[PDB]
Design a protein around this ligand. Structure first.
Ligand SMILES: Nc1nc2c(ncn2[C@@H]2O[C@H](COP(=O)(O)OP(=O)(O)O)[C@@H](O)[C@H]2O)c(=O)[nH]1
Ligand SMILES: [Mg+2]
Lengths: 601, 301, 362, 400
């Protein structure tokens, strides 16, 4: 019996309820390695099989093997922090932009070519330049909206240069040249080289940067994942490449909002592409800025080391400026037959002041290996090539006093075979097992996790109990009595799009946390069970997956003329297919709507 | 027993292609991806048991071979058994090749005066067919005028036909000692087993070690040995695609019967019977009689 | 230091040839024929940082192989390298020439810089600029293409630091106020105000909240950069012996100036050389610091004995005698007092009546 | 400490690797480390990625033309390590070239290698290269059983053998020089090098050259001779651990005592006369002398010498006025310079009174007594500075 099996998707969008249905379809079957598993259009390949942390070839699934759904086709997002450290050298003589692009991005693209994964990549360069103005009126009127004020009184502007918007292509190593040509002209772009009508402007430290704002921008991208739903990408990941050592000076409210948004769904991956893993707790948030230290354990930190020569590896950077008796001896070691007693006390030792007080206590009786929280962290290449999805199962469940102490219980009953009128070709009217499975699927598609019929479902601080017993469906919702009432954060930034060279557009967006307890689950249950309402797709708070298609005329001849090498593209005369035969195109549209209605003639 | 073989020639003449095809089990289409040889690539080939061929695949460039005749003259040309010089027939600098061949000949005579010279005129497939003879005899009249210092045979080779195996069989036939003993053994085996043609190959390279054709041989082709060597090498590569070793071949033609079985630990023997009245099972243990005889001879010795 | 920058490549129908050199004909044909094995190499040696000592020179290089299909036979086989004097260090130009080989590899894979003949002519101005501003300033910033710019910097190539033990005392030699404290490491920012010159590594680790292994690696990294140096504990019962370098005090004037600027107290006059030399030479085994203080009160009027002992141990003017009695012979009283918790007087009270292991003054 | 010892031959049979003691492949290293005849007789220094190959190729004057003894180093080492390894490689190459000239040793051992853990007892060349690697990797006394085959040394020093004299005469060949066997058979721990030169009827420079050759190969050391006025001291590089192999060798050769106890007797600076008690017999004293010789062979003791620094008829006045007039007035301020003999005694030793020459060198070179020099220090106690420390000359003489 296996205890872990991994299934990887490719070029196909799979929902979480579809993943649950595939896991139910693989519940009592034998699996071998590199096996194509297909179930109701969901094709998947068994990547690796584990028995007791050992990779095996065969195995059996017997309802206790946890499955892992990875994706080789994901909406990946790459953020590159072009702070002041990107022009700095290292102990190996490489620039940190040179180290990052030539080592990590090249290694990532070659490992993507090796694993043959086709992601939808978005690469964006983000930075923050601090100005020396002491007022607002120094800046011009056209781009005054994107210039903010720090808590220390400094004036800054956040720049976001997009080089790839949503492109999917093979051989991504041709991208890096363009990234290199966005390195030479970058201080001209972010107004460091004395742009007209501006103050001086200085590129910020990577610690004093817009890191959490970039994470929340990626979260604002991934929040509206239902708006333009493609059918060939599954996973989501957001990658932040930084030239700082991992410390950040962030706001407390922004960190609380970012953590609360990551509780609902987990995307955020940061790695350090400069090296030199420091001798403290490495993901570090210095609060009250943008001391009080916070260590985010929700960030999957990684460290890249490209190439080196012989020496010991340094961890600290070096800086040069521009330019009476027996009482002293007793305080030397203060706060930092007896020989056999002392030796057996030292043998009973097997951390400084604890052992010293242990010696001082036990002496009255009977008269540089690196620590584990500072070890070398590699690059998680498995999470960066085939990003795993959110797990369908969780093991956390509070007790009865925890469930009765902080949660409010509200029940709703749905009697089956009288309230259900979903008809499939006027046949069976959607029996309660199908409605129960659809209820668990609709809960899982929003991001709930099954607590390991009757299913217990959890997402954040809300608990759901969906129970099918003796032809009765009962759904109970457990909402917390003290909800996380966070606030909205207004954000302004300068954005340069993917097909623009130097035109920075002033944009604004608001960082907000959605309310999972305010989701209208009763309306969705009425939509699933009852067939007569059906107008609930127009309700925007239910978050229906939507996509849009346009039926366009096929001007094949002029398009083939332009792609053959015509210089002028205005070869369409006055209307697409201006005369041709006017009833031939209408008969083609009649045949198309016949194909829409499944009418065969 | 170590034999030192020099493989010299001009740049791009195809020496590494011949070394890869004959000894390293390459094919002709896989030699297009061969890179340039920097200095000398030494190769050790186990050919017929105790005999070891030292193949010195020298680089053909000008700065390499100026260094060969000046600083490495004592290292290269001393104790040379067979010198192989490769001539590109499509080279436009044949007069430049002749002076360098004369310098290599002078170094070989001044260092190792008991050696054999083989002038392999390579790339004959780039010459049109009806011109393929009188061009070669045009070069063969020159080099035999040049190489009066040592024993020299000139051969027209190409990697796209059977002439390469003929040339390398003629090269390795001189390196094998006591070849009249193997010829007398093959003659007595063909007389004893009533065989029309007995050909002995090598196990790995499938070069023709020795052969004996009687007067009742139905084959009239003079280039049959290298053709059969190409056939069994292609079938050995076909078996190696299936991760299997070819062991025995048996044929029963209309008027002949060919048997390819292992003879020693390093040889294969082809036995062709011109009499169709002799069955396969008689000959298939008539070979095993001689195999048991040479096993009983080599067990004591 | 760099005397010539040469770019060689493998010709078709000619061997390894030299194409461009910066001071006209520096590398002779005999010199290049001597080391053409290590310049255009076999595939077992390619993409390696091969430096070789010549007849009088040091040929640094890194051969590059590409292995495409569009090339002459299959590959390019170029080599750009430096050559210096044979008695030079040449341990800092090896990452520079490997980074230049990587620059040429990326430039050839992007814009075909070595394949095209019109971009071969640009290598001579690049190498003249490289030899001009790598010898002078040790830092080159040369834009090549629209996307490529050569960034090079010489690293000082410091030796490996010793392992810092728990009983060692770090002492500054580099004047903390001449450092931008805002851009240090955060661990180093925690450790640096508690260093002084008389505190242990465990006493720094417990006086701050930094772990012992973290402050050991941080003290080792500060030893690597030459910021701090390690001395021993400076208890008043320590016994010190002189080293033959005491005469190196009076054979070197800069050591005398460093002693008269370091050993003397704050606000006092400069001490005489005779007093400091007699205080160094009065150190005998069997006599502690208190015997030195009671023996010589005139020479310690303007002389701090703590700074005297610290600068004696820093420049190896004096050595120490630790008593070696775990009560095995590997550990001294400093290691045992650092491990267990007792002071010198308590451990000397326990270990005076020792009938098993006899005290060794190693 | 080198990584490996590589022996690479070259000739008409191709470039071959004969030996590599810690078990790049052999063919690739044989291709890399082989040189040409124009590179022979010079220093061969080659660094590939992180390993540095230091050697000295030598023409063999058979199919072999060239051979090379190559030491592989981590390339973070000092240039002194590279220099002494190049010196060791060229000395081993000269020894093997002379063996090839004598009895064809290298060609026969190369044929024995090419005919082929088990290689080490079968091959003597593998044994001496292993002995060279073990002598390089450790700071202790390792015997170099290769071959004998032929700067700051003082005449008051003594030559002490690191092993038995009978073993050194056993290891020496038939064709050894008479001077070397006379030096080994004549010398002693008490007899100094001047008495070694005048007792073995050899010149002093030849005795110095033979002593340098003996201390290079790890067969002898240069120490001060044994005397009762020699104050000894425990060395900082000594090991007082009971589990040390030197403690096991001391327990094997001297079962009556233990090494940490005797090394704890040398904790304070005491002389050999202070060990001699009226209760202690002379047999215990001679056993202690043998133990002192044994741990001086292991460099576990250091000798403390008294060093004197200088501070503030006609030839005496010229030597007194050769130095500065401020120190001359400081000398004149001392009333003990009113004696006629004390001025000549101070002016005769002005070059020795710089802290580089100890009291034993002064009393040996001038043939004077120690009491006269101590009286001279008592006359000028307000000028001279007297210190005691070890001799830095003794640490130079070591097996490189
Ligand atoms: N048409 C033809 N091409 C050949 C023949 N022999 C070699 N070649 C080609 O010529 C090239 C010679 O390269 P190579 O063997 O490495 O030359 P080398 O450096 O002298 O050994 C190979 O890529 C072969 O494809 C031949 O007989 N006929
Ligand atoms: Mg070749």
């Amino acid at each position: 019996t296996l205890d872990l099996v991994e299934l990887t998707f490719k070029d196909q969008y799979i929902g979480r309820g579809d993943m649950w249905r595939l896991k139910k379809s693989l519940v009592s079957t034998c699996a071998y390695i590199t096996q194509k598993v297909e179930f109701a259009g969901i094709r998947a390949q068994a990547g690796e099989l584990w028995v007791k942390n050992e990779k095996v070839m065969c195995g059996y699934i017997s309802e206790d093997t946890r499955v892992v759904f990875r994706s080789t086709s994901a909406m990946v997002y790459i953020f590159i922090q072009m702070s002041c450290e990107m022009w700095d050298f290292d102990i190996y003589g490489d620039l940190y932009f040179e180290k990052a692009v030539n080592g990590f991005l090249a290694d990532l693209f070659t490992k993507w070519k090796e694993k043959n994964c086709s992601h939808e990549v978005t690469v964006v360069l983000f930075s923050r330049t601090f100005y020396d103005a002491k007022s607002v009126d120094e800046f011009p009127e056209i781009n005054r909206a994107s210039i903010r004020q720090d808590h220390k009184g400094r004036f800054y502007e956040d720049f976001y240069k997009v080089v790839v918007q949503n492109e999917r292509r093979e051989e991504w190593t041709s991208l890096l040249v363009t990234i290199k040509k966005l390195f030479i002209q970058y201080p001209v772009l972010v107004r460091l080289e004395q742009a007209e009508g501006f103050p001086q402007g200085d590129n910020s430290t990577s610690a004093q940067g817009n890191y959490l704002e970039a994470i929340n921008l990626s979260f604002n991208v991934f929040d509206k994942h239902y708006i333009n739903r493609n059918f060939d990408r599954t996973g989501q990941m957001s990658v932040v490449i930084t030239p700082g050592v991992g410390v950040f000076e962030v706001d407390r409210l922004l960190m609380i909002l970012t953590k609360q948004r990551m509780i609902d769904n987990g995307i955020g991956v940061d790695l350090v592409c400069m090296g030199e893993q420091p001798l403290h707790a490495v993901p570090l948030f210095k609060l009250h800025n943008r001391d009080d230290y916070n260590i985010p354990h929700w960030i999957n930190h990684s460290f890249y080391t490209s190439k080196s020569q012989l020496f010991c590896n340094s961890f600290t950077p070096r800086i040069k400026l521009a330019g009476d008796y027996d009482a002293y001896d007793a305080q030397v070691f203060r706060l930092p037959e007896a020989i056999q007693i002392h030796h057996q006390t030292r043998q009973n030792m097997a951390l400084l002041e604890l052992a010293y007080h242990e010696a001082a206590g036990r002496h009255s009786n009977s008269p540089p290996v690196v620590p584990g929280f500072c070890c070398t962290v590699g690059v998680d290449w498995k999470s960066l090539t085939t990003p795993a999805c959110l797990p369908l199962t969780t093991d956390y469940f509070p007790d009865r006093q925890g469930l009765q102490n902080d949660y409010t219980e509200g029940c709703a009953d749905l009697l089956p075979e009288a309230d259900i009128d979903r008809r499939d070709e006027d046949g069976v009217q959607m029996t309660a097992q199908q409605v129960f499975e659809e209820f668990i699927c609709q809960r899982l598609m929003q991001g709930y996790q099954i607590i390991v019929d009757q299913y217990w479902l959890s997402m954040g601080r809300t608990f759901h109990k969906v129970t099918l017993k003796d032809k009765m469906i009962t759904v109970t919702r457990y909402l917390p009595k003290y909800p996380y009432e966070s606030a909205q954060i207004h954000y302004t930034y300068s954005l340069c799009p993917s097909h623009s060279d130097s035109e920075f557009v002033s944009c604004w967006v608001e960082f907000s946390h959605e309310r999972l307890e305010e989701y209208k689950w009763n309306y969705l249950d009425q939509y699933i069970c009852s067939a007569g309402s059906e107008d609930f797709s127009l309700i925007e708070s239910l978050k229906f997956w939507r996509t849009r298609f346009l039926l366009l005329p096929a001007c094949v001849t002029a398009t083939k003329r332009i792609t053959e090498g015509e210089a002028h593209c205005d070869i369409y005369g006055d209307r697409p297919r201006a005369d041709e035969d006017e009833w031939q195109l209408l008969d083609g549209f009649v045949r198309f709507v016949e194909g829409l209605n499944r009418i065969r003639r | 027993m170590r034999k030192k073989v020099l493989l010299m020639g001009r740049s791009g003449s195809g020496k590494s292609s011949m070394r890869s095809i004959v000894f390293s089990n390459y094919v002709a289409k896989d030699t297009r991806r061969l890179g340039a040889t920097i200095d000398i690539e030494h190769s050790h080939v186990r050919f017929l048991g105790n005999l070891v061929l030292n193949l010195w695949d020298c680089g053909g460039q000008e700065a390499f071979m100026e260094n060969y005749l000046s600083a490495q003259r004592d290292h290269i040309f001393r104790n040379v058994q067979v010198l192989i010089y490769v001539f590109d027939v499509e080279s436009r600098e044949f007069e430049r090749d002749l002076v360098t061949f004369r310098n290599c000949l002078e170094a070989t005579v001044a260092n190792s005066p008991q050696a054999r010279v083989f002038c392999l005129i390579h790339k004959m497939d780039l010459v049109q067919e009806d011109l393929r003879d009188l061009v070669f005899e045009e070069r063969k009249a020159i080099l035999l005028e040049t190489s009066k210092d040592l024993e020299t045979t000139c051969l027209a080779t190409s990697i796209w036909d059977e002439t390469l195996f003929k040339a390398w069989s003629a090269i390795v036939y001189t390196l094998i000692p006591n070849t009249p003993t193997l010829e007398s053994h093959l003659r007595e085996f063909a007389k004893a087993a009533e065989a029309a043609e007995v050909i002995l190959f090598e196990r790995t390279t499938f070069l023709v070690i020795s052969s004996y054709s009687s007067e009742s041989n139905p084959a009239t082709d003079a280039h049959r040995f290298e053709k059969i060597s190409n056939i069994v090498k292609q079938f050995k590569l076909s078996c190696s695609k299936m991760q299997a070793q070819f062991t025995t071949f048996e044929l029963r033609g209309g008027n002949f019967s060919a048997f390819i079985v292992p003879y020693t630990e390093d040889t294969y023997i082809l036995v062709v019977i011109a009499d169709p009245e002799i069955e396969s099972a008689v000959t298939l243990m008539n070979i095993q009689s001689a195999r048991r005889f040479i096993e009983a001879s080599k067990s004591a010795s | 230091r760099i005397e010539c920058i040469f770019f060689s490549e493998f010709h078709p129908t000619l061997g390894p040839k030299i194409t461009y050199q910066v001071p006209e004909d520096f590398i002779s044909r005999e010199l290049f024929d001597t080391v053409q094995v290590y310049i255009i190499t076999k595939p077992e040696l390619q993409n390696k940082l091969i430096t070789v000592t010549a007849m009088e020179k040091k040929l640094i290089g890194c051969p590059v192989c590409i292995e495409h299909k569009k090339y002459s036979r299959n590959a390019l086989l170029f080599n750009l390298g430096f050559v210096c004097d044979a008695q030079a260090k040449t341990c800092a130009l090896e990452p520079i020439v490997k980074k230049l080989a990587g620059y040429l590899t990326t430039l050839e894979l992007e814009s075909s810089f070595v394949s095209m003949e019109e971009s071969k002519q640009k290598l001579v101005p690049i190498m003249t600029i490289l030899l001009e501003e790598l010898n002078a300033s040790g830092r080159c910033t040369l834009p090549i293409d629209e996307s490529n710019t050569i960034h090079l910097k010489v690293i000082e190539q410091r030796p490996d630091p010793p392992v810092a033990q728990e009983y060692d005392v770090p002492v500054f030699t580099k004047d903390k106020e001449d450092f931008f404290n805002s851009q240090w490491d955060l661990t180093t920012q925690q450790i640096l105000p508690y260093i002084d010159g008389f505190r242990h590594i465990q006493k720094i680790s417990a006086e701050a909240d930094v772990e012992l292994n973290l402050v050991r690696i941080a003290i080792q990294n500060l030893l690597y950069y030459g910021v701090v140096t390690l001395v021993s504990i400076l208890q008043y019962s320590n016994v010190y012996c002189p080293t033959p370098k005491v005469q190196d005090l009076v054979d070197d004037k800069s050591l005398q100036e460093a002693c008269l600027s370091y050993v003397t107290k704050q606000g006092h006059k400069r001490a005489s050389l005779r007093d400091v030399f007699q205080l160094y030479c009065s150190l005998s085994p069997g006599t502690t610091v208190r015997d030195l203080i009671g023996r010589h009160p005139q020479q310690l009027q303007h002389v701090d004995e703590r700074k005297l002992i610290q600068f004696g141990l820093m420049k190896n003017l004096i050595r120490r005698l630790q008593k070696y009695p775990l009560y095995t012979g590997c550990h001294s009283y400093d290691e045992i007092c650092c491990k267990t918790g007792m002071s010198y007087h308590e451990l000397d009270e326990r270990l005076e009546n020792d009938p098993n292991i006899i005290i060794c003054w190693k | 400490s080198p990584i490996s010892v590589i022996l690479v031959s070259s000739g008409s049979r191709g470039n071959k690797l004969l030996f590599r003691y810690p078990f790049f492949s052999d063919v690739i290293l044989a291709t890399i480390l082989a040189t040409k005849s124009e590179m022979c007789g010079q220093k061969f220094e080659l660094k590939i990625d992180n390993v540095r190959f230091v050697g000295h190729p030598t023409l063999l004057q058979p199919t072999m033309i060239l051979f090379n003894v190559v030491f592989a180093l981590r390339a973070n080492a000092d240039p002194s390590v590279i220099n002494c390894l190049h010196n060791l490689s060229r000395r081993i190459a000269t020894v093997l070239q002379h063996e090839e000239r004598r009895c064809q040793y290298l060609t026969r051992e190369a044929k024995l290698i090419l005919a082929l853990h088990h290689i080490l007892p079968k091959c003597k060349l593998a044994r001496d290269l292993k002995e060279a690697y073990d002598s390089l990797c450790t700071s202790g006394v390792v015997r170099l059983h290769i071959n004998s085959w032929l700067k700051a040394i003082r005449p008051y020093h003594a030559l002490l053998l690191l092993s038995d004299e009978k073993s050194l005469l056993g290891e020496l060949p038939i064709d050894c020089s008479p001077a070397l066997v006379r030096v080994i058979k004549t010398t002693s721990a008490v007899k100094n090098l001047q008495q070694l030169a005048q007792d073995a009827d050899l010149a002093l420079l030849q005795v110095f050259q033979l002593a340098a050759h003996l201390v290079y190969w790890g067969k002898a050391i240069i120490i001060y001779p044994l005397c009762e006025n020699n104050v000894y001291m425990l060395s900082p590089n000594a090991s007082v651990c009971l589990y040390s192999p030197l403690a096991e060798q001391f327990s094997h050769q001297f079962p009556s005592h233990d090494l940490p106890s005797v090394l704890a007797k040398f904790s304070l600076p005491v002389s050999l006369s202070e060990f001699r008690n009226p209760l202690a017999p002379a047999v215990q004293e001679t056993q202690l002398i043998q133990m002192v010789v044994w741990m001086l062979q292991r460099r576990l003791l250091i000798q403390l010498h008294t060093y004197v620094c200088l501070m503030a008829q006609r030839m005496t006045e010229n030597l007194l006025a050769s130095l500065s007039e401020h120190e001359r007035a400081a000398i004149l301020s001392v009333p003990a310079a009113q004696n006629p003999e004390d001025l000549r005694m101070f002016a005769r030793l002005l070059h020795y009174f710089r802290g580089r020459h100890h009291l034993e060198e002064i009393m040996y070179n001038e043939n004077t007594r120690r009491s006269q020099l101590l009286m001279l220090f008592d006359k000028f106690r307000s000028v001279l500075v007297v210190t005691t420390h070890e001799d830095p000359v003794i640490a130079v003489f070591q097996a490189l």
